[PDB]
Design a protein around this ligand. Structure first.
Ligand SMILES: *O[C@H]1[C@@H](O)[C@H](n2cnc3c(NC)ncnc32)O[C@@H]1CO
Length: 149
């Protein structure tokens, strides 16, 4: 499928990887999600990534996928978990913020089996009407210095 904008929820089990992503403009995901994001990148004008650390209760910001996975990009930057991930790709964070899932009220995702937004696994796609609004709301918040600490 070809389209203008697509939106994916990214989960991280460690805050340090979010900090590394922000400092270096890089991400990597599971091998299966890497194929999904790669297919989206080559078929979509803009692939937006909405970042939510595990057990953080919400989103820390969003960014645009800028390149395809590349084994030569920052090899091994995540440590040994690199072995369980696809290759690294460039991401440009467009906003760092704090928005809790609870602030959005009850929201479910029709592209993810009617699961609550807060129950999204890594790589979950959201429909464009919802994804666009999530990015708009994030952009309208004050920027948060996530690297504080
Ligand atoms: O639920 C997810 C998730 O939080 C985690 N995940 C996926 N991709 C990453 C990265 N990329 C650098 N860093 C930390 N955690 C990550 O994996 C589980 C699924 O096993």
């Amino acid at each position: 499928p070809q389209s203008t904008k697509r939106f994916f929820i990214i989960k991280s089990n460690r805050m340090s990887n979010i900090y590394t992503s922000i400092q270096h403009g890089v991400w990597a995901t599971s091998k299966g999600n890497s194929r999904k994001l790669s297919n989206a990148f080559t078929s979509t004008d803009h692939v937006l990534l909405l970042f939510s650390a595990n057990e953080s209760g919400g989103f820390q910001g969003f960014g645009r996928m800028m390149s395809l996975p590349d084994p030569q990009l920052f090899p091994g930057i995540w440590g040994p978990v690199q072995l369980r991930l696809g290759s690294n790709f460039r991401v440009m964070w467009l906003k760092q913020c704090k928005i809790e899932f609870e602030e959005l009220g009850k929201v479910t995702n029709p592209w993810n089996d009617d699961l609550p937004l807060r129950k999204s696994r890594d790589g979950t796609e959201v429909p464009p009407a919802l994804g666009s609004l999530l990015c708009t709301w994030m952009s309208q918040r004050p920027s948060e210095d996530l690297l504080a600490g």
